[PDB]
From a paper:
Lipoproteins in gram-negative bacteria are sorted to the outer membrane (OM) via the localization of lipoproteins (Lol) export pathway. Among them, [name], an IM-embedded ATP-binding cassette (ABC) transporter initiates lipoprotein sorting by selectively extracting OM-destined lipoproteins from the outer leaflet of the IM and transfers them to LolA, a periplasmic chaperone. Here, we report cryo-EM structures of [name] in apo, lipoprotein-bound, and [name]-bound states at a resolution of 3.5 to 4.2 Å. Our studies snapshot 3 functional states of [name] in a transport cycle, providing deep insights into the mechanisms that underlie [name]-mediated lipoprotein sorting in [name].
Further, to obtain the structure of the ATP-bound state of [name], we preincubated LolCDE171QE, a catalytically dead [name] mutant with 2 mM [name] (the nonhydrolysable ATP analogue). Thereby, we obtained a structure of [name]-[name] determined at 3.6 Å resolution (S5). In stark contrast to lipoprotein binding, [name] binding causes significant conformational changes of [name]. First, binding of [name] leads to a tight dimerization of the 2 LolDs, resulting in the Cα-Cα distance between Gly45 of the Walk A motif in 1 [name] and Ser147 of the signature motif in the other shortened from 16.7 Å to 6.8 Å. Second, the V-shaped cavity is flattened, and its periplasmic surface area is reduced to approximately one-third. Third, in the periplasm, the 2 PLDs become more compact, with a further increase of surface area of 21.1 Å2, in comparison to RcsF-[name]. Consequently, no lipoprotein is found in the [name]-[name] structure, and the U-Loop is squeezed out. By contrast, in the [name]-[name] structure, the substrate-binding cavity is compressed with the U-Loop completely squeezed out. Second, ATP binding causes a tight dimerization of [name] and closure of V-shaped cavity, pushing the bound lipoprotein out of the cavity. The relatively reduced [name]×RcsF adducts upon addition of ATP may result from the formation of the ATP-bound [name] complexes that had precluded the entry of RcsF as indicated by the [name]-[name] structure.
Author numbering:
A (entry chain F), B (entry chain D): 2 to 230
C (entry chain E): 6 to 412
D (entry chain C): 2 to 397
Write the structure that this text describes.
Amino acid sequence: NKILLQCDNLCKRYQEGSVQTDVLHNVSFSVGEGEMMAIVGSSGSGKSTLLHLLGGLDTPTSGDVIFNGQPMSKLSSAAKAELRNQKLGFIYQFHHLLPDFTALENVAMPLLIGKKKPAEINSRALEMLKAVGLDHRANHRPSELSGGERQRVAIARALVNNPRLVLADQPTGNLDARNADSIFQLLGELNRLQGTAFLVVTHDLQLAKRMSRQLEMRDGRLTAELSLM
Amino acid sequence: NKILLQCDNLCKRYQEGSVQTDVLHNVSFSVGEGEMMAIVGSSGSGKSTLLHLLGGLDTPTSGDVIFNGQPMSKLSSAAKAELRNQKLGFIYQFHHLLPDFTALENVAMPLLIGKKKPAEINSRALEMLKAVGLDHRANHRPSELSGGERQRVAIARALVNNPRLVLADQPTGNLDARNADSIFQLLGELNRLQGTAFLVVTHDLQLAKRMSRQLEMRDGRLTAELSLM
Amino acid sequence: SLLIGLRFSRGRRRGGMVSLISVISTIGIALGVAVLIVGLSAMNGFERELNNRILAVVPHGEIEAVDQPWTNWQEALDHVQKVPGIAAAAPYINFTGLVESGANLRAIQVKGVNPQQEQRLSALPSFVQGDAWRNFKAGEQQIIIGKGVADALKVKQGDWVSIMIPNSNPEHKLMQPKRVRLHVAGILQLSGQLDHSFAMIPLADAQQYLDMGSSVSGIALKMTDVFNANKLVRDAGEVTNSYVYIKSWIGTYGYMYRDIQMIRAIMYLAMVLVIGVACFNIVSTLVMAVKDKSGDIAVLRTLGAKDGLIRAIFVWYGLLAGLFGSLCGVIIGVVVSLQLTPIIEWIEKLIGHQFLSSDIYFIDFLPSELHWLDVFYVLVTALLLSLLASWYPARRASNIDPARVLS
Amino acid sequence: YQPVALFIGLRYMRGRAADRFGRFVSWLSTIGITLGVMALVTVLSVMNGFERELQNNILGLMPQAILSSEHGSLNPQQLPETAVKLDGVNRVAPITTGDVVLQSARSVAVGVMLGIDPAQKDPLTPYLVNVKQTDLEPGKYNVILGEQLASQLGVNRGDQIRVMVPSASQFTPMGRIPSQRLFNVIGTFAANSEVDGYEMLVNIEDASRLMRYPAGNITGWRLWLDEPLKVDSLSQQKLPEGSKWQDWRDRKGELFQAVRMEKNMMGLLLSLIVAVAAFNIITSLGLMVMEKQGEVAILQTQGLTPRQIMMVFMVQGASAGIIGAILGAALGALLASQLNNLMPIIGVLLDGAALPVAIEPLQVIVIALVAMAIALLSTLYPSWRAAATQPAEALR
Ligand SMILES: Nc1ncnc2c1ncn2[C@@H]1O[C@H](COP(=O)(O)OP(=O)(O)NP(=O)(O)O)[C@@H](O)[C@H]1O
Ligand SMILES: Nc1ncnc2c1ncn2[C@@H]1O[C@H](COP(=O)(O)OP(=O)(O)NP(=O)(O)O)[C@@H](O)[C@H]1O
Ligand SMILES: [Mg+2]
Ligand SMILES: [Mg+2]
């Protein structure tokens, strides 16, 4: 069952004693390969921080996150980079692009850093930008991009290197209904074809309902667990 | 009656020669007192640029944007600052807060710049935060704030001054359903009582149907112009 | 992707019309190395000129072998001249006295240098305006003529001048004060400094006037070091008689020694501060302008052939910036040190004092000479400075969690 | 919430103390200024102290300047001491300066004698021990001898020394006979200095009687000046007929003057170099203000006028400048050399015994004021450029 991610007792209390806030406390995740997961919840419900901790982008105060059996916390820096460039694709809540690199280079950066063949890199980056919807806006710097198309650039960046896990922090916040539906179509297709597991945090209830598994973050707890079959 | 904002012949083409991408072409708005107004459009169609331009924050290549009769382009810096500090309340597409100041101070900067009494400054900032939902969130810096909390702080920042015109770039992009409903409820209350008018860009269809006037901004054109009664 | 896929990121640190912030790093390195070049070359010129005012002329500091009819000085001369630190040794007569000139008396130091050792172990013939070597031959006993005597003497070629010995001997008897018939054998048009405080006397008359035999007065030394000369001369005199001690000579130009030490320490403690300024500018440039770039790069980092790929990117960034700055600054420093501008007043009309030209204008002053070895030292230290000041912020930003991208 | 728009500047200055290291690079802007000020203060203080030491210890024992007679003998009522008018003149006295030769029981040496009036503030009376303060009475023919010269000549008190002056000679068939006289020394004048090896102190009346001068005729008027810098420019002052100006810049001891001119030139060179380094480090804050484009554009969106942004960044720069200046003064005064003498035993060849430091208050104040003025003035073009760009902060 629990294969791709086994997150146990991960508790995140920032600050020191007698004033620590329970932003994350006793989160348990059993994410399988190809599992369609949607995280929903109100505000300050600890959704972005949960993504940062699962991605190993931060250090959890308590508990552990286990990725492919090998824990991420105990792992070496080189193997962390290997996971982040071959298995983990991260979409931030904000754009967090490189403002000095064009959008094409900003989505090819994972490949240019993973030491791939340049002709393959450019071709697959252009294919991904076409799949996301930036055919005419591939050569524009992020400073000459808008919030939605920067978000689409980030989503493409998390899909370029064919990750096994793609953590997404509000990939549809800055997008309309048409582009949101298109991007979830891409996510469903990658789930069907590549087998990539998408662990996405959204606030739109319809988009989360179009996805197989729902988890509700409230008071730093996982409440809603709905299974039909 | 159309008094507040009268935008005509507004165009923006500012880029390197030949590649110069146009984003707007002959856009005209008539916003009056209390006109609860919304702009809907696909990403990259020229919505955030339009508000950054009619708010005076950018320089239009051609056309006139006039606020209460006086054009912004012909106006000096001091009166522009006076308008932005007394009549215009701007919610940026992203957070765009001051990282050096806590939430309460980031909310109260317009009051502090308005040369107001601090005793009522703190009271008004606390009133706006308790209305939005961040009474307990005032002691956190933006670096310790979340995307939804940052957007709510920006919304409070644009609403403390009670401006006549409040421009909003995706005020609920990073917000859940309950917070979006509550914030649009506060928007309606301020419109009904304080008489302030909101020019809000949004992608959620239901929140746009909650709006009194709806225009569709796409490819430098205004397509939909719907009036019920 | 070995050579091209890593300098790409560091080369893309130009941005859109925002390159005017990294240019303060190239200029920061250029100005630093230029002022370092100017300071080091100026200090070296100072040291060279001062060494021409202490040891090159009037060598001060030596063991005064005080003896009656000294004769076996050959053994000590050979044992001391070849010790490490001593360039050469040469005996001279360091007498003092009065010389007759036009029924007047002039008090002068008699420098009985050796004509046989003059060409080899002295720079007297090399410093003259240039004349035939036979003109400085011994035996005929030609002495240099001075302005203070020639003004009222009117002595030319073929004129013989009488010189009477001062007779400053322990004997109460006159003992025939040596009478020297000097002959004018040349003329100089360089300066009167060599014609007022310096004199030359043949060894025969010097030995005859001493009421003794071949009595040597002093055995002077020409050297290259002055800092270690104290203990060196002390040890050289340690092979002499123990009953005859040596009084220290430090106090004569100890204050000039302290002047040298002061200028050296001040230059060093200001130029390491220029070093600190360059490091500060580079760390400020790489801490704020590009830190979230390192954040998300580490979010999507490479395989791991070398753990510091971000460190490598910033090493190439710092190397490029520091190298271009160092080249420009070295060019500027060399061009300004080698010569000043032909016309100084033209540039400095807007001096800010609203005064014509410059009140303190100087011509062929502030001498300076370049040591290209110092240029290589400053180049290497500037490149190491930029490399460290670009690596340490990189290491600080890499090891921190990528959840420092929002703060 | 101070309603003077300096609240945001203060919050920028104290802010972003996040990981115990970000605050260091935040305060780097004033650290550069305080280090530049430390350098300038220590350079000027050491130069001033060493100049004072050289002007006192060496130059107070030898004559500073002399006024003499252009033609013939020197007539005192032409210009007496009370009528001695010159620029920067501090102390006036009569004196005779003479190059003489001394014959002792061991050998013969040369030197200079200074004939003075013992009733004045003689700088050698404290150094005259084992002897009367004015034992060189007029006609007593008593000359006080120093330490180095006596040790070199092997002569003690009570001996007769033959002092001769070459200027007053006479014709003789056996040679030249100058003015020679035997004088008895009663002790030693342990000056504990450098000049005591060739300088002699004599009465003025007996010296005047020695060179066959008429009644009341002295060699010159000695002036102890106040500054050695203006010496070159003050050689064309009001010297009427029957007088001429001489001094230690080129007549005697010219090596000291030459090395002082060279040291001054290199000192101004190093000062210019440190000043341009200080300019390069004010460019650090000039780019630091340009680094906060997002914040200035957000504030300008808040309706804050561009001149008020100029005031905000000028106040930040001025606060950095004043902090840097006061710390530079603190580390140039309290830590000039006052902490274990910089521990000179390390293999860097440091001389801890030589500490010619004199912290001039006027110089440190003017240096700190200029540093503060530059630190505020360097946020005028960056701030106007920041406020000139409209709130187009789309991460350009
Ligand atoms: N210098 C520029 N100024 C304005 N727009 C530009 C500029 N350069 C490029 N553009 C393009 O023109 C579009 C401007 O429209 P914009 O308003 O930014 O889109 P948008 O409405 O923000 N999409 P969304 O993010 O969903 O709101 C951008 O998508 C850019 O691709
Ligand atoms: N280091 C920190 N110090 C203080 N508070 C923090 C810190 N990190 C996070 N928080 C708070 O803890 C909560 C984090 O939850 P988070 O998942 O980021 O909310 P969010 O869902 O991403 N925002 P939104 O979904 O748009 O409503 C927020 O209330 C933050 O203000
Ligand atoms: Mg937008
Ligand atoms: Mg969130």
